[PDB]
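Section 4.2 – Deliverable D4.2 (structural model, holo form)

The reporting period included a commitment to supply a predicted holo structure for the target in complex with zinc ion. Inputs used:
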Amino acid sequence: NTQTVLPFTGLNTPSGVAVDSAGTVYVTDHGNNRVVKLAAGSNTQTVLPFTGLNTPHGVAVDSAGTVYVTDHGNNRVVKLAAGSNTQTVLPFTGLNTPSGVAVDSAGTVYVTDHGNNRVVKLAAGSNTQTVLPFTGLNTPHGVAVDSAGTVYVTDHGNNRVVKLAAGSNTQTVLPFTGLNTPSGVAVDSAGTVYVTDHGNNRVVKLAAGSNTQTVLPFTGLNTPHGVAVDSAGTVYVTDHGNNRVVKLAA
Ligand SMILES: [Zn+2]
Ligand SMILES: [Zn+2]
Ligand SMILES: [Zn+2]
Ligand SMILES: [Zn+2]
Ligand SMILES: [Zn+2]
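Output (structure tokens):
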């Protein structure tokens, strides 16, 4: 229940955040064009060996430790395997300012194509990307995917979070209320969905199937951007406006 600013150093507008299965926190550093990681309990960040990023936004990490980053300004998505020093460009096409990124258990990569009002996915090893059947989006921002392959997207212009069930492709608006420009989104191991309410300076959680949302006890947030949740329920938020990454111990 305790809130602590993590010992990242030299951050310039942290944006995206992810946590891997070990509790390591990965953060995109907008102004610095870099991605930094901090193991649980470590006080020493590591700068990942990406190169040539232009305002990196979203970050995701798969169960193998491979790191995926949206290169917002260069309209591309890059990845870095664990321990590797050389980034690979993913064969997405036609992107315009990709923002959020997520990866499922099969290595399929989901990207919110901000400027094109669409969400696209790309299986590992494939040369054809698939536009997902979301409807009525007015600029998607954050994306997350759960074990069922269900995809969650924050819809900037409609102040809502939408769910796409795998298979039936039924789109459902999650019953959040009072959102003001939802941005980041995450889903924990229980299926609970977390959203950064960018305009209201708060983080909100909603169990699937519930009409009770819970404001998480973060304090003094200024345009919170990214959110991630680890297996123990610890929530990490990038406080874009305050240049910090905040942890809330479960
Ligand atoms: Zn940003
Ligand atoms: Zn963007
Ligand atoms: Zn946005
Ligand atoms: Zn922001
Ligand atoms: Zn974002």
